[PDB]
Each structure stands twice: as C-alpha cells, then as structure tokens.
Design a protein around this ligand. Structure first.
Ligand SMILES: Nc1ncnc2c1ncn2[C@@H]1O[C@H](COP(=O)(O)OP(=O)(O)OP(=O)(O)O)[C@@H](O)[C@H]1O
Ligand SMILES: Nc1ncnc2c1ncn2[C@@H]1O[C@H](COP(=O)(O)OP(=O)(O)OP(=O)(O)O)[C@@H](O)[C@H]1O
Lengths: 528, 530
C-alpha cells in the first residue's frame, strides 16, 4: 500500500493514457461538458509474463484511494464469480456491477480474464456462453452503466470474445512488452533505491546492458540473489548449524562479483520454455569477429535505417560466406542480439518441424502476422540453401506470397544466411535479394591483427601464471601457421593449446609444458 | 435510462424503423385495416449483425417513442438469462410469470438482449435445464391459448446458434440485419455525434471524414470524437499531466481542429478488423498520384461488366481478370484498392495463406463455405489473387470443387469473381483461359504510368520538402529524375522515392542546403536497378 506510480519504471505513456480515463473526468468535469464527451472507460492490458501489468493496477488503486476525489476499487481474480447452482453464477456478476454503481466513481479490475471470457463456442458448456452474454449485456446494454471503469489483464489476447473488444466495452488495448536498455536501468534504480551503500549510476548502466531478455521480475530477483550470494560468501559457517549466530551486519556489502555469480546462475523467464535465436559472441571469439559484426551493422544501417521519420523500403539482407566462416553460427545471432528492442521471429527447420499438432504453414502464417503487428521486427531464416531444400511447394507458395502482402513501407527486416554464393542459389531466391540495392554481404576471414589478439592472452599471460622470451616466438609461429584456417579450425587449435595449460596447473615451474605447446602446434593438421 | 433518444440519432437505419412501426404503432392507430382482411400483423423480430451497429440503440429509442407518447405500450427488458433460478421448477416458472405480467398490461413489448445466451440449439450433450427452458419458451410464444398483443424482440450477435424452431412465422417471423454503415450512413452518425458542438463542423469536413472511416461501426465513429477532443486538450495544455493538481484552463483555446482528427485515427483500430485484416486497402498517400487513374479505368471496365456499380441493372456472371507484367502492381496495389472502392459489397478471399493457413479445416471446405456465403449475401465479391500460382498450388479435388461451384451460382446473380495474374492471358493453362472471355470485356491490361503521373509523384518531395526550413536547380534535378525513371515498374519507382527520402531525413538539422542537393544528385546518379 505504498506503491504510487513511483515503482512503475519504463511505462509512462500508459500511465498518461490512464490518468485521462480515471483522473481527469473528476478533476476537470467542465471540459467534457463542452463537447459532450464521456471519455473512454475501458482498457485491456496484455503482454508477456512479468512485465508490469499487475504493478500498474496496484499503483492506480493506491493513487485514487488516497486523494480528494475518493474512488472505489473492486478486484476479481480469474473466474471467482462461478457458483454451482444454475442461476447464481451470473447473479454474482449482476450483484457486483450494481454494488459498483452505488459506489461510483469506482473501478472493476478483472485479473486474468482468459478464464472468464473465452470465445463463445458450442463445443463447450453453456455456463461460459451464458456468462459472456450477461457480461457484454451488462457492460454496454440499455441502461448506461455510468462512471464505472472496467479493466482486464491477460496474456492471451486472441482468446477473448471479439464482441468484448469494441468501443463501449473495452475501448483501448495496452501492450506491456519487455524492457529495453533504457527502461531496465530505471527498474534497477527503483529496486536498489533504499540501499545503505548506494550503487553508482555507471554500474547500473553496465548492468542494464548485460541483462538482455530480462523483464521486471527478473531484475528484482537478481537484486536479491546478489545479496544472498554475498551472505553465503561472507559467512560459510551459517549453513552447517541449526541456531542463530552473531551475524555482523557491517561486512555484508555487495560487490560486482556477487552480481556476476547471480547472473551466472539465473535464466530469464522469457527463455525458459524456448531459446532465443540471438546470442552475443563469447568472450573467446569476441576479439575475432566484432569488426565483422560492426561492418554488417553498417550495411544494415544503409538498408534498414531504423537502426520526420526514417523511411525504409523492404528491408532485406543476405549474409553469404564460405562454409566455415561462421555467418549462421557466430555472426547473424550476434547481429540479432545487437538489434534488441526489435522482436525476432525465427523460421528455421527445428521450429517448423520440431513441433507437432501444427502445420509448417500454420506457423509460417502466424510468425508474419505477429511480425507485422509489432513492427519494426525481424524475420530470421538461417541457412536458406538448405531451408529451401527441406520445404514443400505449398510452404514456398505461402511464404513468398506472405511477404508480398506486407505494406511497401513496412519496417520488417528479412535476415537470412547462406553457404553457397548468391550465384549458386536456386532461382526464386536470387530475386529476393537485389545486391544492386546493397542486400548482400560477403564475409571474409579475420586479419592478422585480429588473429594475434585472439591468441595473445592465451600464449602470454595465462601461459605463465602463479601456482618470457620464447613465448613471443611461439605466438609468432602460431599466428604464422594459421593464416588460412577458418573459424572452426581456429577455435579448435585454441582449445588444443589450452589443454596443455590445464594439465600443468599444479606445476610451480614452467619450461616443461612449453615443449607441450611446441609439439601440439607442430602436430596440428587441418584441411582447407 | 436516457429519455432523449427517440429516432433522432439512429442514423443509417431507416428501412428498419419503418418496418418496426407497422408492428407496434399501426395496429393501435388504424385498427380497422387489420380487421378488414383479419390479418393480425407480425409480432416478432430478431436483430442481428456485427458488434456495434444500432441493435440496442433502436430498442432504447423504441422504449422512449412508446412510453412518452399518446398510447401506453409497456416495456419489459431482459438481459441474457436472468430467468434462471436455483430451485428445481423455478427457472421455467419465472418465464411464465413474465408472460403473464405482460398479458395483464397489454399492449406491451418484451426485449431479450443477447438471446443466444438464453435459447441455444437443443443438444443432448448439455444440461437438461437449457433443453427444457427452450421447449417452454417456444410453447408460450405459439402454442394453444393464443398469446395476445405482446411484441417479442430478441437481439443477438450469433444468429445460427439459436434454436431453428424459434425462427418461424409465429414466433420470430422477421429477421433484421444490422450491417456496417456505408459512406452516406456514416455521414449521418457523424452529424449526430457532433450535433451540439461549438463552431459546428462543415458538411464538407464531415464528408472528408466519412470517406476515411472505412470499417467503422457506429461506436467507432462515436469514439473518434472523444479521442479527438482529448488529443486537442493534450496539445493545448501539455503541463496538465505533470502536476496531479487542479489548474485554471481557459475553455476557449481548446477548439477541435483537423490534425487532431488525424492523429486520433492513427491510434485507432476499428472493432471489425481488430482480429482479422480485410483484403482491401486504399492506396497510400505516396502511391496515390501514381495509380489512382489506373484504378479509375479498372472501375470503368467494371461498370461495363458489373453494372451494379453506379428497370434494374441486369448482369450475367460478372468476371474480370487484371493482367500485367510482374512488378506493375496489380495484385499488390490495384486489386485491393478496387476492393476498397467497392465497399457495401461483401468481400471473400480465396488465397493460399487462407486456404493452407488454418488447420482442423479442409482446404476444399473453406472454398465451399465462402461460395455459399457469397451466394447468400449477394451482391458480393470472391477474390482470387494470383491465379497463375493459385492453380499450381491446389489439388485436383479443390479444382473440381471450385470450377463446379461457381457454376451452381444462378446466372443473373450479382456475384463478381475478381482475379489477377502476372503471366499474360495466353500463357495461362486452358482450364483457366476459358473462364475469361476477352471479347466479353473480362480482361484488363495494366500499363506503366506516364510522365504526368511520375512528375506528380516526385514533385512535392523534390520541390516542397527539400527546402523545409528546420530553387532553380531543384527543378533540373526533378526533370532528370522524371526522365531517367521512365522504364521502371512501381517497385523501382517507390524504391527510388525512399532512397531520396533517406537523404532529406539525414539532412534535417542543417539550416543551409547545398550539402543535401549534391548528396541528392550523386544518389540519383548512382541509382541502378535494371
Ligand atoms: N516497470 C517495473 N518496475 C518495477 N518492477 C516491475 C516492473 N515491471 C514488473 N515489475 C516486477 O514484476 C512484478 C509483476 O508485475 P505484474 O504481475 O503486473 O506483471 P504481469 O504482466 O501481471 O505478469 P503476469 O502476466 O505473469 O501476471 C511486480 O511485482 C514487480 O516487482
Ligand atoms: N446508427 C447509429 N447512430 C448513432 N449511434 C450509433 C448507431 N449505431 C450504433 N451506434 C452507437 O453504438 C452504441 C451501441 O451499440 P449497439 O447499440 O449496436 O449494441 P451492440 O454493441 O451492437 O451489441 P453487441 O455488443 O453484440 O455488439 C451506441 O452507444 C451508439 O452510440
């Protein structure tokens, strides 16, 4: 009862839209007399789980409860109005709507309406069709319900009777989506506000950009796993006894390493049932391909200028390379990760076919509807030289005519990759990418500069640790030998050279494992 | 209850009020015409249609037109099913009371709002209470012991989920369709909801509005007015949302203009296309000066073959096939614009993402459903875009269904078949070639726009926007663009347009030009497409 639009970070247009349905007709009643208005009194929250849909209703209740113009608040769970006797289910609804009419102004909040108002079908019990009919007949009927603001919250929007969604019943619909890098930082400032050792802004700014895919609840949860980790690290004897000890509340300060352990043990809620098709370069491969990622992002910026309003025409790009250059394995997911705040919808083999009781066409038809709705979006088809060889002609005819229906100036990017050059691709694909327009990117192998930094830290610093003139020669030899390896062979040779280092952890003296490195780099053969 | 609604705001529905005052008003006013022939006029209706169209508004107007009048017809109003009761025989008994109380105060009206929640179709799998309350509702509407002078009315959104024994001449002998308004009917709802305003809006402005509100239904038209007023209030006082306090605002600088009716229609989705998109869209503001004339020519050809696009106009198997080269924008820009121009005709689509896009339904079952629906509600369109591909994507069972179902249609039924193709007519298969009879006028050939069309396309962008503060060589650039882009199709044209708009965007904040004009010049010079 102490949350008042203060803890709600990242959602500011929704709150502004919400104080003109509830607050303004009470504060400025003479503006709505000039035009005879009666502003909208129906909204519908929807989105993925954890994204601030119940926090906003809580804050609005507390905002209107404490003030001059006291408003009521009636709260309902999913389907708690159901009774077993044949006339009582829809008598409790009539009772609730009439009780709210003598308290007005009031607010009726329906939490999780997915279980109250399904689409009326004959293949179910009458109890649901009767409840929906009375609900819609009571909301907007012959009686002018009055100053009652009805709100509902849901995850599954399209499973609600389409007669409830029209001006007069549920006028406005509100999308609560995952936070971007700038709202994650607001949420982090909120949840780490009354802390003894107030964290710096430059630290929260680095945290907000590492917690990609998080949503509200996940940030609030790491802000607590960090404290539990600090506690466990400071007092290891608190898990081997069954009584209260003298906990010194002064040496329990939270450090960055605790946040690191918290973020290492935790998976966000969004990618728990699925996996995201976008992943940053590992810390090993990062000093090898970030320059290529930057070049691809510049090409995108040329074709997809959403990365006066920017105007883009059929945003499309095709990343081509040789098999092994890592364009569908390291590069395109890193570009997808760099372009977060744009929702991604993959169409690849283990997604069309790796799920049954749904056709490939029914998934290809929905991943484009949802991409048109939430534009600017991305539609990801990797390895099209095989994707186009593992699909039927019905799926080709559906796909190639579903992106011909997208508006001419639709901010929807089609990103794809291939191993065979653009000329070796079949027809009907060479006409989707028009490199006269800059819709083709040709990857090339990393330069010497990058290849040296790929190996330096391994062969120089971690080479001779705790528990120096020949190592330069070894590094030069390694970089000279591998001037034509692709990426797979490069990182293979990286693990082979790191193996010897591991078997000599307990050796206090070097010069015995240097021969190991010499012979391992010598007897390492590839292909190419 | 509001006592001010009395057939004054119910714009658009005049053929229903006229049929509704000869069931209630006339047997009281002229009770000698009905005992000349001894006819006993119809005393049953059934309102139905899409959500938000004037079904309940007409009942709210009838209640007032009869209560506050000479004669005293009584009104009984029931919501979905509020006759149900907890104890055993009490659900049915209540109904009888409602019909007896109505018999003692006759003449009277009973109005069942959302009657599809009271009287479903009787099925042996559901509760016995519903199957036994339908059989007692339809035993006291028309059984022995004549009803009397009660007028029963029922309003619903699902018509075919009502027991078919109720839809009968003697229980519900008149079904009324409340469909989406057309243009002339939207420019009456608009004059009703802005009836008592300040500086009353011009009829020319209300016509400009009624043209752009396609897909709106009564409630959306009433809602855009509120949204426009709110947008104006926000535009005038931006500091009225950052105080949570009462302030002093002069109720005179808050006049509603245009550009607030225009921003309201951005964040507004009609109720009809909120879960499914219609296959008809008008030309965007960019492409319009490039293809409106082609749309008009197509509509003239339609006028020839489909006379119902102005005795009576008589037609015979109205068909047309819009052919053009690939890229000429006939199945992507033109056919939906022709569909959108022909509103007030119902439009069904038969294309791949719709046949092979929904499961648990045969592909040759939807094809049999849409043709039946189109027959039922003629004049109607059946839209098959890209038949040069549609024909090589369906099986022979679906072909034998489709070609023999468009023959079962009566000859003079105004059901139009609209299709497009990229292959010329000669390159199509025979079984399709023989469905269009060019010597009959059933083929239209598209051609590239002319110099005039291209000049008007590029003019306002190269001339009146390149200056745009945050004149003799701009016209030379315009001439060069209109020259070099003379063998392009529409995709390449509207691609060059976006390529030139990306420069102007990049050079927003530069107060001085001549860094934008040479940029423009090199961009147009470097553009290569074919
Ligand atoms: N913008 C935010 N600022 C602070 N905390 C947030 C924010 N968004 C979400 N949270 C945290 O997430 C919790 C859930 O909010 P809410 O439950 O309304 O989301 P939801 O969409 O209802 O989730 P679900 O759909 O699973 O019910 C809150 O208790 C809050 O701690
Ligand atoms: N012809 C009209 N003239 C003026 N207003 C109209 C008209 N038609 C509809 N409306 C608006 O629509 C609102 C009511 O909708 P309606 O009376 O059609 O019930 P309904 O919403 O159709 O029932 P359901 O919920 O099944 O759709 C009214 O408030 C009215 O402002």
């Amino acid at each position: 009862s102490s949350v008042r639009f203060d803890s709600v970070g990242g959602l500011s247009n929704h709150i502004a839209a919400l104080k003109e349905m509830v607050v303004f007709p009470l504060l400025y009643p003479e503006v709505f007399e000039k035009f005879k208005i009666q502003p909208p009194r129906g909204c519908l929250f929807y989105g993925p789980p954890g994204t601030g849909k119940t926090l906003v209703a809580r804050a609005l209740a507390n905002e209107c409860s404490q003030g001059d113009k006291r408003v009521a608040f009636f709260m309902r769970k999913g389907a708690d109005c159901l009774s077993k006797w044949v006339g009582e289910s829809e008598r409790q609804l009539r009772l609730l709507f009439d009780q709210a009419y003598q308290m007005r102004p009031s607010i009726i909040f329906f939490d999780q309406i997915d279980g109250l108002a399904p689409v009326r079908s004959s293949r179910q019990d009458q109890i649901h069709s009767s409840i929906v009919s009375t609900l819609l007949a009571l909301m907007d009927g012959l009686d002018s319900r009055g100053e009652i603001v009805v709100i509902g919250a849901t995850n599954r929007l399209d499973s609600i009777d389409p007669a409830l969604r029209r001006p007069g019943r549920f006028d406005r619909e509100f999308l609560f989506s995952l936070p971007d890098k700038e709202a994650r930082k607001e949420i982090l400032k909120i949840h780490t506000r009354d802390w003894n050792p107030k964290p710096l802004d430059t630290f929260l700014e680095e945290l907000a950009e590492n917690c990609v895919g998080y949503c509200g609840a996940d940030i609030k949860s790491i802000c607590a796993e960090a404290a539990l980790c600090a506690l466990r690290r400071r007092y290891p004897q608190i898990y081997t006894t069954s009584e209260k000890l003298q906990l010194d509340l002064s040496s329990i300060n939270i450090s960055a390493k605790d946040f690191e352990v918290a973020m290492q043990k935790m998976i966000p809620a969004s990618q728990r049932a699925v996996t995201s098709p976008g992943q940053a370069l590992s810390t090993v491969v990062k000093p090898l391909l970030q320059n290529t990622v930057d070049k691809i992002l510049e090409a995108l910026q040329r074709v997809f200028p959403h990365a006066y309003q920017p105007m883009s025409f059929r945003p499309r790009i095709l990343i081509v390379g040789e098999p092994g250059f890592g364009q569908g394995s390291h590069l395109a997911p890193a570009v997808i990760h760099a372009l977060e705040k744009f929702t991604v919808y993959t169409l690849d083999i283990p997604v069309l076919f790796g799920v049954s009781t749904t056709s490939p066409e029914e998934t290809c038809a929905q991943v484009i509807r949802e991409a048109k709705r939430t534009a600017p979006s991305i539609v990801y088809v990797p390895h099209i030289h095989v994707w186009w060889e593992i699909v039927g002609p019905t799926l080709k005819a559906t796909f190639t005519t579903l992106l011909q229906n997208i508006p001419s100036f639709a901010p929807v990017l089609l990103l794809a990759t291939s191993d065979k050059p653009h000329s070796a691709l079949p027809e009907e694909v060479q006409e989707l990418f028009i490199r006269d327009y800059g819709e083709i990117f040709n990857v090339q192998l990393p330069d010497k500069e990058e290849r040296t930094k790929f190996f330096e830290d391994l062969i120089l610093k971690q080479a001779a640790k705790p528990p120096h003139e020949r190592l330069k020669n070894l590094l030069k030899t390694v970089v000279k030998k591998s001037q034509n390896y692709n990426i797979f062979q490069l990182e293979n040779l990286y693990a082979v050279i790191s193996q010897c280092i591991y078997r000599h952890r307990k050796d206090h003296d070097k010069t015995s494992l240097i021969q190991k490195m010499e012979q391992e780099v010598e007897n390492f053969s590839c292909s190419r």
